[PDB]
Amino acid sequence: GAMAPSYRVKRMDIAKNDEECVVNAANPRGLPGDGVCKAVYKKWPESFKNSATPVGTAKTVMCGTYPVIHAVGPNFSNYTESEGDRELAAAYREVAKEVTRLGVNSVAIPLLSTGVYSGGKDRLTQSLNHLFTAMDSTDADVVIYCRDKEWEKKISEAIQMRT
Ligand SMILES: Cc1nc2ccccc2[nH]1
Ligand SMILES: [Cl-]
Ligand SMILES: [Cl-]
Numbered sequence: 001g002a003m004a005p006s007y008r009v010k011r012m013d014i015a016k017n018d019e020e021c022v023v024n025a026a027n028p029r030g031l032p033g034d035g036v037c038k039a040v041y042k043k044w045p046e047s048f049k050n051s052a053t054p055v056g057t058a059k060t061v062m063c064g065t066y067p068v069i070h071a072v073g074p075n076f077s078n079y080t081e082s083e084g085d086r087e088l089a090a091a092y093r094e095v096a097k098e099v100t101r102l103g104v105n106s107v108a109i110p111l112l113s114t115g116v117y118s119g120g121k122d123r124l125t126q127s128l129n130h131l132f133t134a135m136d137s138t139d140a141d142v143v144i145y146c147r148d149k150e151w152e153k154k155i156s157e158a159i160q161m162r163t
């Protein structure tokens, strides 16, 4: 575990993280995809061997000794708000199980279902609050990766509000 487990946010490519493992915002079929998933595929392509897994689950595949946790958030274009919310909470609970099992002291995480799976809605608060529900009981240092400057400010404020 980390000496004083923390949350941080960085505005940069998660493929350049400084943590002991990475969470991929994966698709259920293990395909290269786009956004976070394509960056992860370019950096750790070996991790996409038998990475296919259902919505609401997470599957870990090694790239050398570096773990890639493929977490499959719902596509809100396809799910009801209610069913999508349940699957999004579930995907993060499965990430917390994998981070615990791996014994890592740190993890790089994106906000699941906030990009092309958002069904065109702003889901920053929804996705972040499900990330906290899952990860609060883990002792890894969590570093949240985003692209947008306004999202960085909002995520930082949400972290700071609990401190
Ligand atoms: C956190 C993160 N990493 C990315 C890589 C490519 C595109 C969007 C991304 N967002
Ligand atoms: Cl970057
Ligand atoms: Cl997404």
Ligand SMILES: [Cl-]
Pocket: 146, 147, 148, 151
């Ligand atoms: Cl973002």
